[PDB]
Coordinates of C-alpha atoms in Angstrom, one line a residue:
Chain A
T1 CA 0.0 0.0 0.0
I2 CA 1.1 3.6 -0.6
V3 CA 0.1 6.7 1.3
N4 CA 0.5 10.1 -0.5
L5 CA 1.6 13.1 1.6
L6 CA 1.1 16.6 0.3
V7 CA 3.1 19.4 1.9
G8 CA 3.1 23.1 1.1
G9 CA 5.3 23.7 -1.9
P10 CA 4.2 25.4 -5.2
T11 CA 1.6 23.6 -7.2
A12 CA 3.5 24.3 -10.4
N13 CA 5.8 21.5 -9.4
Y14 CA 3.2 18.8 -9.1
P15 CA 3.9 15.9 -11.5
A16 CA 0.2 15.7 -12.5
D17 CA -3.4 16.3 -11.5
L18 CA -3.4 15.1 -7.9
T19 CA -6.9 13.5 -8.4
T20 CA -5.0 11.3 -10.9
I21 CA -2.6 9.9 -8.3
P22 CA -4.0 6.8 -6.7
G23 CA -3.6 6.0 -3.0
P24 CA -4.8 7.5 0.3
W25 CA -3.9 11.2 0.6
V26 CA -2.6 13.0 3.6
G27 CA -2.0 16.7 3.8
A28 CA 0.2 18.8 6.1
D29 CA -0.5 22.5 6.7
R30 CA -1.3 24.1 3.3
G31 CA -1.2 20.7 1.8
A32 CA -4.5 19.8 3.5
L33 CA -6.3 22.9 2.2
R34 CA -5.1 22.2 -1.3
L35 CA -6.3 18.6 -1.1
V36 CA -9.7 19.8 0.0
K37 CA -9.8 22.6 -2.6
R38 CA -9.3 19.8 -5.1
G39 CA -12.2 17.8 -3.7
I40 CA -9.9 15.1 -2.3
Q41 CA -10.8 13.7 1.0
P42 CA -7.7 13.2 3.1
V43 CA -7.4 10.2 5.4
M44 CA -5.4 12.4 7.7
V45 CA -4.6 16.1 8.1
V46 CA -1.7 17.5 10.1
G47 CA -1.5 21.0 11.5
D48 CA -3.8 23.7 13.0
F49 CA -6.6 24.7 10.7
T50 CA -15.1 23.2 4.2
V51 CA -12.1 22.3 6.3
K52 CA -14.1 21.4 9.4
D53 CA -16.3 19.6 6.9
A54 CA -13.5 17.6 5.3
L55 CA -12.0 17.0 8.7
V56 CA -14.8 14.8 9.9
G57 CA -13.7 12.1 7.5
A58 CA -10.1 12.5 8.5
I59 CA -7.7 11.7 11.3
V60 CA -6.8 15.2 12.6
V61 CA -3.3 15.5 14.1
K62 CA -2.5 18.8 15.9
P63 CA 1.1 20.2 15.9
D64 CA 3.2 19.1 18.9
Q65 CA 6.3 20.5 20.5
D66 CA 9.3 18.5 19.1
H67 CA 8.3 18.0 15.5
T68 CA 7.8 20.1 12.3
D69 CA 4.4 19.3 10.9
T70 CA 6.0 17.5 8.0
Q71 CA 8.0 15.3 10.4
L72 CA 4.9 14.8 12.4
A73 CA 2.9 13.8 9.4
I74 CA 5.5 11.3 8.3
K75 CA 5.8 9.8 11.8
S76 CA 2.0 9.7 12.2
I77 CA 1.5 8.0 8.8
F78 CA 3.9 5.2 9.5
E79 CA 2.8 4.6 13.1
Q80 CA -1.0 4.9 12.5
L81 CA -1.7 4.1 8.8
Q82 CA 1.4 1.8 8.5
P83 CA 1.7 1.7 4.7
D84 CA 4.6 0.1 2.8
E85 CA 5.6 3.4 1.3
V86 CA 5.0 7.1 1.5
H87 CA 5.2 9.3 -1.6
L88 CA 5.9 13.0 -0.7
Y89 CA 4.4 15.5 -3.1
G90 CA 4.7 19.3 -2.9
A91 CA 8.1 19.0 -1.3
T92 CA 10.1 20.9 -3.9
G93 CA 10.3 24.4 -5.2
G94 CA 9.5 27.7 -3.4
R95 CA 11.2 28.3 0.0
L96 CA 14.5 26.5 0.0
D97 CA 14.6 25.9 3.8
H98 CA 11.5 23.8 3.4
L99 CA 13.0 22.0 0.4
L100 CA 16.2 21.1 2.2
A101 CA 14.3 20.0 5.3
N102 CA 12.3 17.7 3.2
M103 CA 15.4 16.2 1.5
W104 CA 17.3 15.7 4.7
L105 CA 14.3 14.7 6.9
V106 CA 15.4 11.0 7.0
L107 CA 18.8 11.8 8.4
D108 CA 17.3 12.2 11.9
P109 CA 17.9 8.8 13.6
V110 CA 14.2 8.5 14.5
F111 CA 13.1 8.9 10.8
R112 CA 16.1 7.1 9.2
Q113 CA 14.5 3.7 9.8
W114 CA 11.9 4.8 7.2
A115 CA 14.4 6.1 4.7
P116 CA 13.9 3.1 2.4
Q117 CA 10.2 3.6 2.4
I118 CA 10.1 7.4 1.6
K119 CA 10.2 8.9 -1.9
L120 CA 10.0 12.6 -3.0
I121 CA 8.3 13.2 -6.3
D122 CA 7.7 16.3 -8.5
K123 CA 7.5 16.9 -12.2
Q124 CA 11.2 16.7 -13.0
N125 CA 12.5 14.5 -10.1
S126 CA 12.1 11.3 -8.2
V127 CA 14.1 10.9 -5.0
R128 CA 14.8 7.7 -3.1
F129 CA 16.9 7.1 0.0
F130 CA 19.0 4.1 0.9
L131 CA 20.7 2.7 4.0
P132 CA 24.1 1.0 3.7
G133 CA 24.1 -2.0 1.5
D134 CA 24.2 -3.2 -2.1
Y135 CA 21.4 -2.3 -4.5
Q136 CA 20.1 -2.5 -8.0
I137 CA 17.8 0.2 -9.4
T138 CA 16.0 0.5 -12.7
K139 CA 15.8 3.5 -15.0
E140 CA 12.6 5.5 -15.0
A141 CA 11.4 5.7 -18.7
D142 CA 10.7 9.4 -18.5
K143 CA 14.0 10.3 -16.8
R144 CA 17.3 11.0 -18.6
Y145 CA 19.6 11.8 -15.7
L146 CA 20.8 9.7 -12.7
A147 CA 22.5 11.2 -9.7
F148 CA 24.0 9.7 -6.5
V149 CA 23.9 12.1 -3.5
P150 CA 25.8 11.1 -0.3
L151 CA 24.1 13.0 2.5
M152 CA 26.8 11.8 4.9
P153 CA 30.3 10.5 4.6
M154 CA 30.7 7.1 3.0
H155 CA 32.6 5.0 0.5
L156 CA 30.5 4.8 -2.6
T157 CA 30.9 2.4 -5.5
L158 CA 29.1 2.8 -8.9
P159 CA 30.4 -0.2 -11.0
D160 CA 28.0 0.0 -14.0
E161 CA 26.9 3.6 -14.7
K162 CA 28.1 6.0 -17.4
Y163 CA 30.4 7.5 -14.8
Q164 CA 31.8 5.2 -12.1
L165 CA 33.3 5.3 -8.6
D166 CA 35.5 2.9 -6.8
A167 CA 34.8 3.0 -3.1
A168 CA 35.1 6.8 -3.3
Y169 CA 35.0 8.6 0.0
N170 CA 33.2 11.9 0.6
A171 CA 34.1 13.9 3.7
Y172 CA 31.0 16.0 3.4
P173 CA 27.7 16.2 1.5
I174 CA 28.2 16.0 -2.3
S175 CA 25.9 15.8 -5.3
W176 CA 27.3 13.7 -8.2
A177 CA 24.8 15.1 -10.7
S178 CA 24.3 14.2 -14.3
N179 CA 25.2 10.5 -14.4
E180 CA 23.3 8.0 -16.5
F181 CA 22.2 4.4 -16.7
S182 CA 24.1 2.1 -19.1
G183 CA 21.1 0.0 -20.1
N184 CA 17.9 -0.2 -18.0
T185 CA 19.6 -1.1 -14.7
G186 CA 22.5 -0.1 -12.4
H187 CA 24.1 -1.1 -9.2
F188 CA 25.7 0.7 -6.3
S189 CA 27.1 -0.1 -2.9
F190 CA 28.1 2.1 0.1
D191 CA 29.1 1.5 3.7
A192 CA 27.7 4.3 5.8
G193 CA 25.4 7.3 6.2
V194 CA 22.3 7.8 4.0
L195 CA 22.4 7.9 0.2
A196 CA 19.9 9.8 -1.9
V197 CA 19.3 8.7 -5.5
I198 CA 17.8 11.2 -7.9
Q199 CA 16.5 10.5 -11.4
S200 CA 15.6 13.7 -13.3
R201 CA 14.5 15.2 -16.6
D202 CA 14.5 18.5 -18.3
Chain B
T1 CA 32.4 44.7 -7.6
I2 CA 29.4 42.4 -7.8
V3 CA 29.8 39.7 -10.4
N4 CA 26.6 37.9 -11.5
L5 CA 26.8 34.3 -12.5
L6 CA 23.9 32.6 -14.3
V7 CA 23.7 28.8 -14.4
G8 CA 21.1 26.5 -16.1
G9 CA 18.1 26.6 -13.7
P10 CA 14.5 27.4 -14.9
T11 CA 13.8 31.0 -15.8
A12 CA 10.6 30.9 -13.7
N13 CA 12.8 31.2 -10.6
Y14 CA 14.6 34.4 -11.6
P15 CA 13.9 37.2 -9.1
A16 CA 13.4 39.7 -11.9
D17 CA 14.2 40.7 -15.5
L18 CA 17.9 39.9 -15.7
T19 CA 18.5 43.0 -17.7
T20 CA 17.4 45.1 -14.7
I21 CA 20.2 43.6 -12.5
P22 CA 23.4 45.7 -12.4
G23 CA 27.0 44.3 -12.5
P24 CA 28.8 42.2 -15.2
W25 CA 27.4 38.8 -16.2
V26 CA 28.9 35.4 -16.5
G27 CA 27.1 32.5 -17.9
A28 CA 27.8 28.8 -17.4
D29 CA 26.4 26.2 -19.8
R30 CA 22.8 27.0 -20.5
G31 CA 23.2 30.2 -18.5
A32 CA 25.3 31.7 -21.3
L33 CA 22.6 30.9 -23.9
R34 CA 20.0 32.7 -21.8
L35 CA 22.1 35.8 -21.3
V36 CA 22.8 36.1 -25.1
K37 CA 19.1 35.5 -25.8
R38 CA 18.2 38.5 -23.6
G39 CA 20.8 40.7 -25.3
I40 CA 23.2 40.7 -22.3
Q41 CA 26.9 40.7 -23.3
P42 CA 28.6 38.3 -20.9
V43 CA 32.1 39.3 -19.7
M44 CA 32.8 35.6 -19.5
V45 CA 31.4 32.3 -20.6
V46 CA 32.1 28.9 -19.3
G47 CA 31.1 25.6 -20.9
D48 CA 31.3 23.6 -24.1
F49 CA 29.6 25.7 -26.8
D50 CA 31.0 23.9 -29.9
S51 CA 28.7 20.9 -30.1
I52 CA 25.6 23.1 -29.9
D53 CA 23.0 23.6 -32.6
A54 CA 24.0 25.0 -36.0
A55 CA 20.8 27.1 -35.8
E56 CA 22.2 28.8 -32.6
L57 CA 25.9 28.3 -33.3
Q58 CA 26.8 31.5 -35.1
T59 CA 24.5 33.8 -33.0
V60 CA 26.2 32.6 -29.8
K61 CA 29.6 32.8 -31.5
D62 CA 28.9 36.5 -32.1
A63 CA 28.3 37.2 -28.4
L64 CA 31.2 35.0 -27.4
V65 CA 33.7 37.3 -29.3
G66 CA 33.5 40.0 -26.6
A67 CA 33.5 37.5 -23.8
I68 CA 36.2 35.6 -22.0
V69 CA 35.6 32.0 -23.1
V70 CA 36.5 29.4 -20.5
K71 CA 36.5 25.7 -21.7
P72 CA 35.5 22.9 -19.4
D73 CA 38.4 21.1 -17.7
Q74 CA 38.8 17.6 -16.4
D75 CA 38.6 18.3 -12.7
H76 CA 35.6 20.6 -12.2
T77 CA 31.9 20.9 -13.0
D78 CA 31.3 23.9 -15.2
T79 CA 29.7 25.8 -12.3
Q80 CA 32.7 25.2 -10.1
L81 CA 35.0 26.2 -12.9
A82 CA 33.0 29.4 -13.5
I83 CA 33.3 30.2 -9.7
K84 CA 37.0 29.5 -9.8
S85 CA 37.6 31.6 -13.0
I86 CA 35.5 34.5 -11.7
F87 CA 37.7 34.9 -8.5
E88 CA 40.8 34.2 -10.6
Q89 CA 40.1 36.8 -13.3
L90 CA 37.4 39.3 -12.3
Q91 CA 38.5 40.7 -8.9
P92 CA 35.0 40.4 -7.4
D93 CA 34.0 41.4 -3.9
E94 CA 30.9 39.3 -4.1
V95 CA 29.5 36.7 -6.5
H96 CA 25.7 36.4 -6.9
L97 CA 24.5 33.1 -8.3
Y98 CA 21.2 33.1 -10.3
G99 CA 19.4 30.2 -11.9
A100 CA 20.8 27.9 -9.2
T101 CA 17.4 26.7 -8.0
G102 CA 14.4 24.9 -9.4
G103 CA 14.3 22.2 -12.0
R104 CA 16.7 19.3 -11.5
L105 CA 17.4 18.6 -7.8
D106 CA 20.9 17.1 -8.4
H107 CA 22.1 20.4 -9.8
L108 CA 20.3 22.3 -7.0
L109 CA 22.1 20.4 -4.2
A110 CA 25.3 20.7 -6.2
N111 CA 25.0 24.5 -6.1
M112 CA 24.1 24.5 -2.4
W113 CA 27.1 22.3 -1.5
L114 CA 29.6 23.8 -3.9
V115 CA 31.5 25.7 -1.3
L116 CA 32.0 22.6 0.9
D117 CA 35.1 21.7 -1.2
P118 CA 38.1 22.8 0.8
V119 CA 39.4 24.6 -2.2
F120 CA 36.2 26.6 -2.8
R121 CA 35.5 27.0 0.9
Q122 CA 37.7 30.1 1.1
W123 CA 35.1 31.9 -1.1
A124 CA 32.0 30.8 0.8
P125 CA 31.7 34.2 2.5
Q126 CA 31.6 35.9 -0.9
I127 CA 29.0 33.7 -2.7
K128 CA 25.3 34.6 -2.5
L129 CA 22.6 32.5 -4.1
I130 CA 19.5 34.4 -5.3
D131 CA 16.1 33.4 -6.6
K132 CA 12.5 34.7 -6.6
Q133 CA 11.7 33.5 -3.0
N134 CA 15.2 33.0 -1.6
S135 CA 18.6 34.5 -0.8
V136 CA 21.3 32.2 0.4
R137 CA 24.5 33.2 2.2
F138 CA 27.4 31.0 3.4
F139 CA 29.5 31.5 6.5
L140 CA 32.8 30.1 7.9
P141 CA 33.2 29.5 11.7
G142 CA 32.9 32.6 13.9
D143 CA 30.4 35.1 15.2
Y144 CA 28.1 37.1 13.0
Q145 CA 25.3 39.7 12.7
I146 CA 22.7 39.8 9.9
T147 CA 19.8 42.0 9.2
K148 CA 16.4 41.2 7.7
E149 CA 16.0 41.6 4.0
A150 CA 13.0 43.9 3.3
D151 CA 11.0 41.5 1.1
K152 CA 11.8 38.4 3.2
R153 CA 9.7 36.9 5.9
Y154 CA 11.4 33.7 7.0
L155 CA 14.9 33.0 8.4
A156 CA 16.6 29.7 8.3
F157 CA 19.9 28.3 9.6
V158 CA 21.3 25.4 7.7
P159 CA 24.4 23.6 9.0
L160 CA 25.9 21.7 6.1
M161 CA 28.5 20.0 8.2
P162 CA 28.7 18.9 11.8
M163 CA 29.0 21.9 14.2
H164 CA 27.8 23.5 17.4
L165 CA 25.4 26.3 16.5
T166 CA 24.2 29.1 18.7
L167 CA 21.2 31.3 17.9
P168 CA 20.7 33.7 20.8
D169 CA 18.2 36.3 19.6
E170 CA 16.0 34.9 16.8
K171 CA 12.3 33.9 17.1
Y172 CA 13.6 30.4 18.0
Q173 CA 16.9 29.9 19.8
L174 CA 19.7 27.3 20.0
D175 CA 22.4 26.9 22.6
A176 CA 25.5 25.2 21.1
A177 CA 23.2 22.8 19.3
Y178 CA 25.1 19.9 17.7
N179 CA 24.3 18.3 14.3
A180 CA 25.9 15.1 13.1
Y181 CA 24.5 15.7 9.6
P182 CA 23.1 18.4 7.4
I183 CA 20.0 20.0 8.9
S184 CA 17.7 22.7 7.7
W185 CA 16.3 24.7 10.7
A186 CA 13.5 26.2 8.6
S187 CA 10.9 28.9 9.4
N188 CA 12.8 30.8 12.1
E189 CA 12.4 34.6 12.0
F190 CA 14.2 37.8 12.9
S191 CA 13.2 39.2 16.3
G192 CA 14.2 42.9 15.8
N193 CA 16.2 44.3 13.0
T194 CA 19.2 42.1 13.4
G195 CA 20.0 38.6 14.4
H196 CA 23.2 36.9 15.6
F197 CA 24.7 33.5 15.5
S198 CA 27.9 31.6 16.3
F199 CA 29.3 28.2 15.2
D200 CA 32.6 26.4 15.6
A201 CA 33.1 24.3 12.4
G202 CA 32.1 23.3 9.0
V203 CA 30.1 25.6 6.7
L204 CA 26.8 27.3 7.6
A205 CA 24.2 28.3 5.0
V206 CA 21.7 31.0 6.0
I207 CA 18.5 31.4 4.0
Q208 CA 16.1 34.3 4.0
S209 CA 12.9 33.4 2.1
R210 CA 9.4 34.6 1.4
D211 CA 6.1 33.2 0.1
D212 CA 5.2 33.5 -3.6
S213 CA 2.4 36.0 -2.8
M214 CA 1.3 36.2 -6.4
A215 CA 0.9 32.5 -6.9
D216 CA -0.7 32.0 -3.5
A217 CA -3.2 34.8 -4.3
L218 CA -4.4 32.5 -7.1
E219 CA -4.5 29.5 -4.6

């Protein structure tokens, strides 16, 4: 099962008509209002808020003290709805501080356990996160570029991509943008931190 | 001397008509094509412009005559090479990066983390990232004072590397807070005209942002 979470980024970055994206929807802050405005009934709304009307059929989660509403929404989704995956929409564009918080959200030890189950999606990008190990990914038909992004120090190996790396160490965050798949699949291995993999298009 | 650098990001994120922005212009990759298209004569161009379209070859070649043309090297991205070349040949006091946001996320993070390289780190204090809703500044360890940008509403402290960060007078505060990985402390705000902060290591990014009032007013 997949739960869709909508945060407050610009609508111009949505990959498609949200009513077109299947799966239960959850909205945080502005995200909830935009889901409602689109006639979408959320299974859960996070924040302090037709709304009251849409909230009867939804699990309402008020803001707390230790979490951002986005972090709270993520934590609440996995603990209460318990899906296999959460697709984050509205997480890019606009305010950069929100964007970066969304991208580095899984670094916090409490949310890292879910890194493998969280994906950011917008019209030009798909973002997945990985924990140390060996993996195989497949090219997304509509994407041209592939990028490996170490969010923390690690030894990264890319044995079969257009550009490769042999247990390369990064002492700080780095974005190896503009790589590409040789064929339809590719492998990668790393021994620490968290790795973000981004497939993008123009 | 403010040197403006335009990279390949979406034009929708520009903060204004590029021709209204003062200071010499440098274009990297697609950025160069966009400057030429707007009638802006770049003082320098960085990127491979020889395997580009015949339809656009001559027209770009005409604009490149009066510009310093820097060819890609083997060690740097074109954006990094542009930054290195600017400090090397244009005697700038500050470098303002435009077109560094939106679009592809791998390029965006690359622009945000560019100054982390030990070599480029010496220029972090002089590189400012600018788009429609944001203005990003970078700092090296020490104590600082900043003021609120007139059009900005939000303030954010973004440690890019492990450090102890102290925020004593902002809406929200931190007392030697430690981060073991990059963190974006978003939505803080100035409490007064100025704000201060101190940190002991790594590189700190500071972001002043605003909402897109126009777009929000449409919903």
